[PDB]
Amino acid sequence: DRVLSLPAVSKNQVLENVFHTAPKAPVEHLEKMVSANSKVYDALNLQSKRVLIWQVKPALF
Amino acid sequence: RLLKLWAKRLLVSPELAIVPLNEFDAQLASKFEGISPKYQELLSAVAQGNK
């Protein structure tokens, strides 16, 4: 019965408790907020190719 | 230290190699007379030697 003197919590149960959640990458905040701000650029700059400033105010002609 | 532990046991009693390590617990019982006879007579006869 030497196996009863070992720790009953396995090495598998330690790793699933210590590393319970996959951690957030430092770069994943950058790539998701730039892809959101690139559509902010495309809506609103006066220098983009597609701009919504001619969709809201159509024309004075 | 694990190899040195099993080197001492197999130098004295080399017939422990006829029982696999994963099947050792499946032979035990609460009493010694209830230990499984799958390996009893084979262990006693390999221990007597090569003659």
Binding site: D1, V3, L4, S5, P7, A8, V9, S10, Q13, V14, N17, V18, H20, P26, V27, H29, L30, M33, V34, N37, V40, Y41, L44, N45, L46, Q47, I53 | D25, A26, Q27, L28, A29, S30, K31, G34, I35, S36
Partner: protein, 184 residues
């Protein structure tokens, strides 16, 4: 953007048919309050742990909550047959492992209660998420959009870092011309 083609007239003068006030402002105000409370709770989890000066991985490791001085039941007293012993050992290990996981959950339930109290009586002053400046009449410029991306990439720099030196080429060829000066 293409509209469904409808060719029909109205008959009686009706109401303007005012729609209900959607709660999306109050849900988003609740979501930013729940995120700020979770940040206030994660801050309260940290200041409790540094006050105890406990190790980071100690309370998440369930081997620390395991009691090794458990009375360790003898298999020779439990009446077992030949194959019955390895199934007995797995039961003794499982009830000791589950008693360590349940003692770890009992710790974190006691730590959550202690930290939700310290989260309540604390003032939250967190920096806000860097978004580009935008007003309803105005239009966001590239200079404000680029300092926002400057704020994202500044967070990519670690808080404590190794000063791993890159050899500059002004230093590298100055050594390599001196090495070529002496025939090497």
């Amino acid at each position: 953007y293409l509209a469904p083609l409808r060719s029909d007239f109205t008959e009686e003068i009706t109401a303007p048919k005012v729609a209900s006030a959607s709660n999306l402002v109050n849900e988003w105000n609740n979501k930013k309050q729940a995120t700020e409370n979770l940040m206030k709770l994660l801050q309260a989890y940290k200041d409790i742990g540094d006050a105890k000066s406990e190790p980071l991985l100690k309370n998440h490791n369930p081997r620390t909550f395991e009691d090794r001085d458990y009375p360790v039941p003898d298999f020779r007293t439990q009446n077992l047959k030949a194959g019955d012993v390895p199934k007995f050992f797995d039961t003794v290990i499982s009830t000791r492992a589950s008693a360590a996981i349940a003692s770890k959950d009992k710790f974190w339930a006691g730590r959550k209660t202690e930290a939700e109290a310290a989260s309540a009586k604390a003032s939250a002053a967190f920096p806000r998420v860097a978004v580009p400046e935008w007003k309803k009449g105005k239009t966001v410029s590239i200079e404000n959009l680029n300092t926002v991306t400057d704020k994202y990439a500044a967070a990519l720099v670690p808080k404590r870092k190794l000063a791993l030196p890159v050899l500059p080429e002004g230093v590298k060829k100055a050594v390599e011309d001196f090495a070529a000066s002496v025939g090497q």
